Ligand binder design. Structure first.
Ligand code: CA
Ligand code: ZN
Length: 137
């Protein structure tokens, strides 16, 4: 008796090899509100074609770029459709992720609060939540 992400949306988080796939899916299993992933991490199929030379521009960076395999941009979905009006609805969906890592035992962090994101009250008007970017520990 739980929601689920679309075929194109689920494939985004389902393409991740990290534990993120857990907090992502498990979220809907431990979250009051509904939500779906839109942006997903890339793979060699994207990095290789991009450069194609052993990427000699890096040595051991962080998970900043989605090419690292850790990162997902979701959005607050309501009534089976994206919702940018229900502000509070985003609150319950925010902890939805950090709430999963608790039972999973893993740690993860996402960006979508004035704390650093700069804002999370009117940013939704952008149509992309100007955030909702999570990342596994
Ligand atoms: Ca933030
Ligand atoms: Zn992003």
């Amino acid at each position: 008796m739980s929601f689920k992400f679309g075929k194109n949306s689920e494939k985004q988080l389902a393409t991740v090899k990290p534990e993120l796939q857990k907090v992502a899916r498990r979220a809907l299993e431990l979250s009051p509100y509904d939500f779906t992933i839109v942006q997903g991490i890339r793979t060699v199929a994207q990095s290789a074609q991009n450069i194609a030379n052993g990427t000699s521009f890096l040595k051991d960076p962080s998970k900043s770029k989605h090419i690292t395999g850790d990162a997902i941009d979701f959005a607050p979905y309501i009534n089976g459709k994206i919702d940018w009006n229900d502000l509070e609805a985003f609150w319950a969906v925010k902890k939805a992720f950090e709430q999963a890592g608790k039972e999973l035992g893993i740690k993860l962090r996402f960006g979508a609060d004035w704390n650093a994101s700069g804002d999370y009250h009117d940013e939704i008007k952008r149509g992309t939540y100007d955030g909702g970017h999570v990342e596994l520990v």
